[PDB]
């Protein structure tokens, strides 16, 4: 019973904390529920659909708030399982963590609105949406990629910024009076931003033919530069996720190495209770050796290069040994002859 209770507590902890499988399914369902709440709130903001939208939203936000409260209670109950935090004081000491603070203040805000409120509801829904990460993984990846490609991103930013400013000013000069859109430089800058980003609202567009020519000559290069960072970030994301996969592979290598070394030592030192013990030990040895050698999957050219270069250095040592032996034979030659 108590052991079952602890096993539950810990499985539930892992599900709420870093999950693997169907725990992702539960997280997807809770995300879908909060997303439905958000869209229903959006509809409620409409005037015509206010009645039914609010009617459904009341029950849906009731369900959302009760689910969030029970999940907070369950998370706190779970934190007591990990050795870092146990008993009464441990759970509170865990709750001192800032993410606990954001989650709990979201909960109390939701309860307070439960028991101009539209703006507060929107704010709390956005905060809940942010809360759905729980690990900063997306933000960490984005920041890491941006830092990695800081030079190219800064190049794109600076060049596109200069292009936008220059094109906007030139068009403004070419359309100061003819086109009422560009009566001020700020309007020209707005036009430049909405074009170079290829949004092209259409509220402001050049009409003087010379202005149109300048707009073309600059929009070519401007749109190219403004599109650059999208592809740069895509490549960065791919590279960084590949790097994380490589590191995970190397850790999955590290563990079976320990397993193999331990089992090999046991098998060496274990040399019909005793015969049975040695049999099971050597059996474990072959199993662990197979597991480790399987874990030694290259996964990358550099990886296999390293594994082979280790053997190549071993080869160098062996050929040094053979050089020593042949030198000994050569020295013996005259000595014995």
């Amino acid at each position: 019973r108590n052991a079952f209770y602890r096993k539950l507590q810990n499985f539930l902890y892992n599900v709420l904390e870093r999950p693997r499988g169907w725990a992702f399914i539960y997280h997807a369902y809770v995300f879908l529920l909060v997303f439905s709440c958000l869209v229903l709130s959006v509809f409620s903001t409409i005037k015509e659909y206010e009645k039914s939208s609010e009617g459904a939203l009341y029950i849906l936000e009731i369900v959302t708030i009760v689910v969030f409260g029970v999940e907070y209670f369950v998370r706190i109950w779970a934190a007591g399982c990990c050795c870092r935090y146990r008993g009464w004081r441990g759970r509170l000491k865990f709750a001192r963590k800032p993410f606990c603070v954001i989650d709990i203040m979201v909960l109390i805000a939701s309860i307070a609105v439960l028991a101009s409120a539209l703006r507060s509801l929107r704010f709390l829904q956005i905060l809940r949406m942010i809360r759905m990460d729980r690990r900063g993984g997306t933000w960490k990846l984005l920041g890491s990629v941006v830092y990695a490609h800081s030079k190219e991103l800064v190049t794109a930013w600076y060049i596109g910024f200069l292009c936008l400013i220059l094109a906007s000013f030139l068009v403004y000069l070419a359309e100061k009076g003819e086109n009422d859109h560009f009566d001020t430089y700020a309007d020209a800058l707005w036009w430049g931003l909405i074009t170079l980003t290829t949004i092209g609202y259409g509220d402001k567009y050049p009409q003087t033919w010379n202005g149109r020519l300048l707009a073309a000559t600059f929009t070519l290069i401007g749109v190219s530069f403004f599109a650059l960072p999208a592809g740069i970030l895509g490549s960065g994301f791919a590279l960084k996720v590949q790097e994380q996969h490589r590191q995970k592979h190397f850790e999955k290598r590290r563990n079976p190495a320990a397993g193999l070394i331990q089992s090999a030592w046991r098998f060496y030192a274990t040399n019909g209770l005793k015969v049975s013990i040695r049999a099971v030990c050597v059996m474990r040895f072959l199993v662990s050796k197979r597991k480790f050698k399987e874990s030694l999957r290259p996964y990358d050219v550099m990886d296999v290069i390293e594994q082979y270069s280790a053997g190549h250095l071993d080869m160098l040592s062996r050929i040094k040994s053979l050089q020593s032996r042949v030198d000994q034979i050569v020295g013996r030659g005259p000595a014995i002859t």
């Binding site: 290598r253 590290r254 563990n255 079976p256 190495a257 320990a258 397993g259 193999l260 070394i261 331990q262 089992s263 090999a264 030592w265 046991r266 098998f267 060496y268 030192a269 019909g272 015969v275 049975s276 013990i277 040695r278 049999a279 099971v280 050597v282 059996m283 474990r284 040895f285 072959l286 199993v287 662990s288 050796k289 197979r290 480790f292 050698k293 030694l296 594994q307 280790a310 053997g311 071993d314």
Partner: protein, 143 residues
């Protein structure tokens, strides 16, 4: 030899409780329970195929004897232990601190009791420098 063959017959009889001359997965599980370790079905099946040469789902006595007839130098595992110790040797110094040995055996894989790591230090750390090279460990283990 014949005496070793008889010892292996005794071991197999202790294993093959059914007595049919094959150690079924259930028999292996029961004996391991006798040892107190906790096996799973998939890991046990992997075990059989690792030690089974016929792939019949059980371990006939001559296969078991051949396994017991397989010595470490015949295992051909020198390269694997080389690679494992290399994995543990981050700096590539050719050695690894005895503290690192204690830590890694005590916090990875099939955790070893203090006695085991102490005797490993005794046999492998012949120089008694705390930094056990992998060359000496593997050569002593194989030879």
């Amino acid at each position: 030899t014949e005496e070793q063959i008889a010892e292996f017959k005794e071991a197999f009889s202790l294993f093959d409780k059914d007595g049919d001359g094959t150690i079924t997965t259930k028999e292996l599980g029961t004996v391991m329970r006798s040892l107190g370790q906790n096996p799973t079905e998939a890991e046990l099946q992997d075990m059989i195929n690792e030690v089974d040469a016929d792939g019949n789902g059980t371990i006939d006595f001559p296969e078991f004897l051949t396994m017991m007839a397989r010595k470490m130098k015949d295992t051909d595992s020198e390269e694997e232990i080389r690679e494992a110790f290399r994995v543990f040797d981050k700096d590539g110094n050719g050695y690894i601190s005895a503290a690192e040995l204690r830590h890694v055996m005590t916090n990875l894989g099939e955790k070893l009791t203090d006695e085991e790591v102490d005797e490993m230090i005794r046999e492998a750390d012949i120089d008694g420098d705390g930094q056990v090279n992998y060359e000496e460990f593997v050569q002593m283990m194989t030879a």
